[PDB]
Amino acid sequence: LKKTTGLVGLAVCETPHERLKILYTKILDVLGHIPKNAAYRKYTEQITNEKLSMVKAEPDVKKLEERLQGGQIEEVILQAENELSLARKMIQWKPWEPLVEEPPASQWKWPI
Amino acid sequence: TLEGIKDRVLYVLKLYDKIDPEKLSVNSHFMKDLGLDSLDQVEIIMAMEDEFGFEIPDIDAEKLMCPQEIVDYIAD
Amino acid sequence: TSVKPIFSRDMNEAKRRVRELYRAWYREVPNTVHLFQLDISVKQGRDKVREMFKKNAHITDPRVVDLLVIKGKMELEETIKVWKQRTHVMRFFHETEAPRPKDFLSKFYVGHDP
Amino acid sequence: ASATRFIQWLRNWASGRDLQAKLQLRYQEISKRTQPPPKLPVGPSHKLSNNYYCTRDGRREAMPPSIVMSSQKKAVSPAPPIKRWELSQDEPYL
Amino acid sequence: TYKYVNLREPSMDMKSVTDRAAQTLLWTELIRGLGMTLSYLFREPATINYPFEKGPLSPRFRGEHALRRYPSGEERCIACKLCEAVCPAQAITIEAEPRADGSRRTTRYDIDMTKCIYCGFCQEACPVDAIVEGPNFEFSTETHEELLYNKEKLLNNGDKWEAEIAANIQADYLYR
Amino acid sequence: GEYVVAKLDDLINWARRSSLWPMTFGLACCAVEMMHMAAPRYDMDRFGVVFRASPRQSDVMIVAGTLTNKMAPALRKVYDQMPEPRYVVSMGSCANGGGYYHYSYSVVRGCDRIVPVDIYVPGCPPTAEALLYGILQLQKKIKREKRLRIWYRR
Amino acid sequence: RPTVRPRNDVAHKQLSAFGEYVAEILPKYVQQVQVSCFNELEICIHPDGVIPVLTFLRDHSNAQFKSLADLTAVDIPTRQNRFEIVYNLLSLRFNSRIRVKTYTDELTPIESSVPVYKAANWYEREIWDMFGVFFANHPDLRRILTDYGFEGHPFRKDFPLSGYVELRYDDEVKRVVAEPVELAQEFRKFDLNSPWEAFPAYRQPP
Ligand SMILES: CCCCCCCCCCCCCCCCCC(=O)OC[C@H](COP(=O)(O)OCCN)OC(=O)CCCCCCCCCCCCCCCCC
Ligand code: SF4
Ligand code: SF4
Ligand code: SF4
């Protein structure tokens, strides 16, 4: 057990494996309320499932951190919380729907 | 107090400069008759909130177009 | 002709915010004249407030009216909070500007401008 | 550099350092204020042949942006994840 | 690569704790600070005796402007207006006409020294070394107007400072 | 009569120029060269020019940097609170006449639109030595004053 | 070649792939995606997508753009929507930068991005001050750089360089006063553009 994450305000996590299993599982549940063909669901389930499989396949925290490449394991937990928060916001936003409106003809033309 | 409330309403209006006392009547319209502006009416109401010491919201204030209607509103 | 609104969805809604702003300005002038120790009368200050409102009386676009109210409230906040100094308040009155000529003959005598 | 030996000893002891080795005033160690003239080199485009500007024209090799999508499979990141920094071996801790 | 500025654990043995107690009660580190300022009291100060002594400058120094001549006395400036075009502050105003002998010369050459940012672009741009920033920096005035240089003032500066200006150009022109 | 008035003028002039306490308006980069004038190499204190004086104890205002429109009222207010005799030193192109920002919508084209200026120090920035030359020029201006001689002849 | 900036195809390919990735996930909002020849990725979006797109890029595990480097506007009068709003983001996780662009006119509010990045607070105030773009639901929208009571938005292309008013101290009223601007020397306009095309690669079709 490390004594500090080295980042001010980021407390050390006593049980990182259990915390990540809970978070990644929560994410796959929220993603189930998104349409099956939405790219956000397919892509997020893919990366979430890869991380969850890494967590189960590696009991040593320092070796798990190397596998995930997300910095400290406490950083990886925080990113999982961010993804879970994002997944819930996407359900209300529904960004997989068609483009709301095309721009005017020369909107993105440069130089004029 | 209906007389008491009404007498004060007229007292303020005469104090207001842009109204001729002789033209003034308890049934005159601020616009159609007295020939006042929208912002003139708003100033009058603000004087009403001062004499009677309570707040008159804009939704209600836009209906008070004659001295009599002010009496009716203050009754409540 | 279908646009995003700012605050008001029509002129009646916008005209309410104008009246609320006018009342706020009307009641603030007496404290402004005292706090800034201005030499103008309270009537002058209110006469100036009314003049500022009246030059915008011809607007019929609720979005434009909304921005005028938005800007008018910023100006009020600057005044009530004494972020403005005395110079900023008195800039509305153009005391050092001499009266420009308005009729054709006067403008003709002094220069070339229309 | 003009301090007496006693004063030199006194200020060295008070500061705890050998101040005379690293005086903050400059004496003769600074470069002369008159120097021999330079003879500066020339750049790589200073050639009499095989030097056409159209083969070394950086500005004209600029291109408009590549439009990858216009409103007219594995997940990816904008780049590989950053590598962990290594602790200094010169002096890991102050 | 990184290092920790402030990540150390105090030793909690009795000797170390008593060392920190002595520092707290006997103000040892504060006394150690008094030693530093005491040692500076007995150092020679860095002050120079201005205006009898001057800070060192180099030939590249950008000071007061001047208009230069050829050895014959003819003006170098031929009113090309490159200096006026490059001036980041628009501090230069030039007018020109054919001289009575047909030479291409200026009739106006003004530098607003209160617009000028003393950047040296004018003397880089000049193709004939006509306008230069000379070595003088001691030309403060009592009025704003005195800092609005016309051509007569700038030619007078060139005649006043040419001895030093030429020598400085001689020292640096091989870097240009 | 003449001799006493002249000698007394010399005395008060010498005291005032030998004890010039500046209020520095460090508006922008020119303020850095002012710090260098206080730094050991030039040591403005050795001339009797204390490093930083309070505005109500000040005899000279040094405007060291760009004066914006937003700042102009505050600068005038400080000048008016200064006790007399008071002098103003304008430092650098910005304060002298707007400088690089002369054509900006937000910049006063010279602090002499706001306060009377005694000395103009050119440069962008003037070197610390150039500013010191200017301060000494102000000292010489004070040495030329004849307040008591003019008072005697009223 | 000593004088030519080298290309970096690996970064160009990575950024292009991520640009398509973002466009696939938020088709509701993404209008255009492009990568420049010096490898900068730009996402052009409908203005309704400001909050969803910025939130996604901040929070998504394959983006993690946790830092808002800059937020600014550009005035282009020839466009119906003259103001281009530019967000420059930085991802420390993937050591990458992305640029998100949307548009608005003089009367259309843009949603404030303060909920996503607290850094946006003052940047949006600056945009309002300098360009007059109104941000909706800002905690405190007001001028930040200009003088109190200053009229107009100076960074608009049609606002004159020296402005409309200037200040001086007036002795009669004993205060600083504002008056119409008169310049002792008018700013001298220069016409510098060469009449010969410089860059064929950017020639516009006639
Ligand atoms: C056998 C029986 C014996 C019985 C008697 C035994 C008694 C003797 C043994 C005990 C020794 C007692 C020492 C008394 C000195 C006072 C000590 C003290 O108060 O220091 C503590 C004080 C605060 O310390 P701090 O680190 O900020 O935090 C501690 C609390 N949180 O820190 C400070 O006070 C710092 C002071 C700040 C001021 C700085 C400027 C002064 C520095 C120069 C001082 C020079 C010394 C003065 C000499 C005077 C000469 C006349
Ligand atoms: S030094 Fe720079 S700012 Fe001054 S006149 Fe020359 S080009 Fe213009
Ligand atoms: S000073 Fe030099 S650059 Fe300027 S107009 Fe004269 S010749 Fe041309
Ligand atoms: S004159 Fe030059 S150095 Fe001084 S404030 Fe202006 S730009 Fe900065």
Q: Is E139 in the pocket of ligand 1 (CB under 6 A)?
A: no
Tokens representing E18 are 């008593």
Residue G114 CB partners (closer than 8 Å, separation 6+): G120, G121, G124, G137, G138, G139
- If DSSP codes are grouped into helix, strand and coil, which group holds residue G165? strand
CA D11, CA C10: separation in Å to the nearest integer?
82
CA F29, CA F50: separation in Å to the nearest integer?
21
Q: Which residues of D31-43 are buried (b: 16+ CB within 10 A; e: fewer)?
A: eeeeeeeeeeeee
Q: Do D71 and A43 touch (CB under 8 A)?
A: no
Report the 10 Å Cβ neighbour count for E117: 20
Contacts of the segment D19-26: beta carbons below 8 A, 24+ positions apart: D19/E39, D19/E43, D24/E43, D24/E46, D25/D1, D25/E44, D25/E46
- Nearest C-alpha neighbor of E63 from the set G186, C69, F95, F130: F130
CA B54, CA D69: separation in Å to the nearest integer?
62
CA E123, CA E65: separation in Å to the nearest integer?
9
CA F52, CA F85: separation in Å to the nearest integer?
18
Contacts of the segment G148-153: beta carbons below 8 A, 24+ positions apart: G148/C78, G148/C83, G148/C84, G148/C85, G148/C88, G148/F70, G149/C75, G149/C78, G149/C84, G149/C88, G149/C91, G153/G129
- Nearest C-alpha neighbor of F126 from the set F117, F118, F135: F135
CA F22, CA G41: separation in Å to the nearest integer?
53
Q: Whose CA is nearest to atom 4 of ligand 3?
A: E83
Contact status, residue A107 vs residue A46, Cβ threshold 8 Å? no
Q: For residue F21, how far is the Cα from the chain centroid? A: 10
Using left for φ > 0, alpha for ψ between -120 and 50, and beta otherwise, residue F11 falls in alpha
Residue G105 CB partners (closer than 8 Å, separation 6+): G80, G81, G82, G83
* Residue C62 CB-half CA count within 13 A: 17
The one-letter code for the residue type at F86 is: R
Ligand 3, atom nearest to E76 Cα: 7
Tokens representing E49 are 């005796």
Secondary element (H or E) of residue A93: helix A73-93
* Residue F101 CB-half CA count within 13 A: 19
The one-letter code for the residue type at A80 is: A
Query: Could you write out the DSSP letters of every residue in G95-114?
Result: TEEEEEEEEE-SS--EE--T
- Nearest C-alpha neighbor of D79 from the set G5, A86, G21: G21
CA C33, CA C42: separation in Å to the nearest integer?
7
Work out whether the CA dihedral A23, A25, A27, A29 comes out positive or negative: negative
DSSP conformational letter for E69: B
Question: Under an 8 Å CB criterion, which residues of F touch E?
Answer: 40-43, 46, 93, 96-100, 102-103, 110, 112, 117-124, 126-130, 132-134, 136-137, 141
Residue D25 Cα to ligand 2 midpoint, Å, equals 35
Distances (CA, A) of G116 to A93, C65, G45, G51: 15, 30, 17, 7
The one-letter code for the residue type at G106 is: E
The answer to the question of whether F124 is labelled as a binding residue is: yes
Ligand 2, atom nearest to E62 Cα: 1
CA B33, CA B67: separation in Å to the nearest integer?
12
CA F134, CA F91: separation in Å to the nearest integer?
9
CA A69, CA A77: separation in Å to the nearest integer?
12
Can you give the resolution of this entry in Å?
Answer: 2.3
Contact status, residue G178 vs residue G166, Cβ threshold 8 Å? yes
Tokens representing F33 are 């060269």
Q: Is E126 in the pocket of ligand 2 (CB under 6 A)?
A: no
Range of the domain at C22: 1-114
Q: Whose CA is nearest to atom 6 of ligand 4?
A: F94
Residue E29 Cα to ligand 1 midpoint, Å, equals 12
G176 interfaces chain F, CB cutoff of 8 Å: yes
Place of tokens 């299993």: A21
The one-letter code for the residue type at E161 is: W
Residue D34 Cα to ligand 3 midpoint, Å, equals 30
Residues of B in contact with C53 (CB under 8 A): 39
Contact status, residue F131 vs residue F96, Cβ threshold 8 Å? no
Place of tokens 């009386």: C57
Distances (CA, A) of C106 to C110, E161, G180: 7, 55, 20
CA C87, CA G176: separation in Å to the nearest integer?
6
- Nearest C-alpha neighbor of G175 from the set C93, C43, E145: C93
E strands of chain F, at which residues?
A: 22-26, 60-64, 87-91, 119-121
Q: Which residue in G has a C-alpha nearest to residue E86's C-alpha? A: G190
Q: Whose CA is nearest to atom 1 of ligand 2?
A: E118
The one-letter code for the residue type at A30 is: V
Tokens representing D60 are 């004209």
Work out whether the CA dihedral B24, B26, B29, B33 comes out positive or negative: negative
Q: Which residue in D has a C-alpha nearest to residue A69's C-alpha? A: D81
Query: Could you write out the DSSP letters of every residue in E71-111?
Result: TTS-BS-----HHHHH-TT--EEEEEEE-TTS-EEEEEEEE
Residue E34 Cα to ligand 1 midpoint, Å, equals 15
Residue A25 CB partners (closer than 8 Å, separation 6+): A52
Q: Does B contact A via 3+ CB–CB distances below 8 Å?
A: no
Secondary element (H or E) of residue G73: strand G67-75
- Nearest C-alpha neighbor of F52 from the set F82, F23, F20, F18: F23
Secondary element (H or E) of residue B59: helix B58-61
* Cα angle A52-A56-A57, degrees, rounded to a multiple of 5: 115
Ligand 4, atom nearest to F32 Cα: 3
Q: Do E64 and F122 touch (CB under 8 A)?
A: yes
- Nearest C-alpha neighbor of A52 from the set A84, A20, A83, A29: A20
The one-letter code for the residue type at G59 is: D
Tokens representing E128 are 């004939």
Show which residues of B are catalytic.
37
- Breaks in chain B follow which residues, C to N over 2.5 Å? none
Ligand number nearest CA of F102 is 4
Residues of D in contact with G88 (CB under 8 A): none
CA D78, CA G14: separation in Å to the nearest integer?
6
Contact status, residue C89 vs residue C38, Cβ threshold 8 Å? yes
Query: Could you write out the DSSP letters of every residue in G186-204?
Result: ---------SS-S-GGGPP
SS (H, E, C) D49-91: CCCCHHHCCCHHHCCCCEEEEECCCCCCCCCCCCCCCCECCCC
Q: Does G contact A via 3+ CB–CB distances below 8 Å?
A: yes
CA A92, CA G41: separation in Å to the nearest integer?
27
Nearest to E175 among D14, D38, D94 (CB): D38
Tokens representing F141 are 């201006």
Q: Is E38 in the pocket of ligand 1 (CB under 6 A)?
A: no
Residues of C in contact with B61 (CB under 8 A): 19
Ligand number nearest CA of E29 is 1
C71 interfaces chain G, CB cutoff of 8 Å: no
Work out whether the CA dihedral G173, G179, G182, G183 comes out positive or negative: positive
* Cα angle E123-E124-E129, degrees, rounded to a multiple of 5: 50
* Cα angle B53-B54-B59, degrees, rounded to a multiple of 5: 145
Tokens representing A104 are 């005017």
Q: Whose CA is nearest to atom 4 of ligand 2?
A: E116
Report the 10 Å Cβ neighbour count for E78: 16
CA A101, CA G47: separation in Å to the nearest integer?
10
Contacts of the segment B12-15: beta carbons below 8 A, 24+ positions apart: B12/B44, B12/B47, B12/B48, B12/B51, B13/B44, B13/B67, B15/B47
Ligand 2: which of E90, E92, E109, E148 to mutate, most ligand atoms within 8 Å of CB?
Answer: E92
Question: Under an 8 Å CB criterion, which residues of F touch G?
Answer: 68-70, 72-73, 76, 103-106, 108-109, 113-115
CA G202, CA D61: separation in Å to the nearest integer?
11
How many domains in chain C?
1
Angle at which helix A73-93 crosses helix G50-59, to 10 degrees, equals 160
Residue E119 Cα to ligand 2 midpoint, Å, equals 5
Q: Give the chains touching F; criterion: ≥3 Cβ pairs < 8 Å.
A: C, E, G
Contact status, residue E135 vs residue E93, Cβ threshold 8 Å? no
Q: Does C contact G via 3+ CB–CB distances below 8 Å?
A: yes
Ligand number nearest CA of E28 is 1
Mutate to test the interface with C, among G142, G153, G181 (most CBs of C within 10 A): G142
Tokens representing A101 are 């409106």
Contact status, residue E42 vs residue D11, Cβ threshold 8 Å? yes
Q: Whose CA is nearest to atom 17 of ligand 1?
A: E25
Q: Whose CA is nearest to atom 7 of ligand 3?
A: E77
